[PDB]
Amino acid sequence: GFKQDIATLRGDLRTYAQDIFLAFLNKYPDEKRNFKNYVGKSDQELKSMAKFGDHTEKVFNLMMEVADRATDCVPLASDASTLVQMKQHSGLTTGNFEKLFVALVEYMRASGQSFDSQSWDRFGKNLVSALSSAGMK
Ligand code: HEM
Ligand SMILES: COc1cc([N+](=O)[O-])ccc1O
């Protein structure tokens, strides 16, 4: 289930992070407005850059912290507030997060693996709600 999925993801964090982020960018190419330094690069061109693996790992590490601190796939309001208040997230609205989680769920469903995709889809919806409650537009 969800807890075991956090363990699976953490076990190969950088690899899963890169592949999920790429699934996101490729599903929603307009989302690349937020990642101007990744424009004009294929998946393997991105993965080769140490900065890409470094960024994606730090992002997914925080995502896994947030997931692990959730109760029944409902994240803490404090974690939602951290995500709203991060300077790096100043342009963002809840739809940016919605899309990330639609891509993450789709990736899990297409994986050969027994991820609890419905738990991830609830977690994304609950995180969107929590972001809104913590003041994201
Ligand atoms: C639960 C979801 C998310 C988590 C945990 C998260 C976490 C983080 C973290 C930790 C950083 C700093 C990374 C580092 O040290 O290298 C970061 C940067 C950033 N995040 Fe997020 N993020 C999330 C979702 C999003 C979404 C949906 C977007 C936009 C679609 C976004 C846009 C950014 C951008 C633009 C930066 C700045 C990257 C740069 O320096 O070039 N994040 N995020
Ligand atoms: C949508 O923002 C991100 C998401 C991920 N990821 O692994 O889901 C990595 C880096 C990011 O900037």
**Whole-angstrom Cα distance, residue 17 to residue 58?**
9
Fold exhibited by the domain 1-137 = Globin-like (1.10.490)
Ligand 1 is surrounded, with C-beta below 6 A, by 31, 34-35, 55, 58-59, 62-63, 66, 83, 88-89, 92, 96-97, 100
Nearest ligand (C-alpha, residue 84): 1
Q: How buried is residue 31: exposed, middle or buried, by Cβ count under 10 Å (0-12/13-18/19+)?
A: middle
* Alpha-helical runs (H) found in 28-133: 43-48, 50-69, 77-85, 94-110, 117-133
**Using N-to-C axis directions, what is the helix angle for 50-69 and 13-27, rounded to 10°?**
100
**Whole-angstrom Cα distance, residue 86 to residue 137?**
14
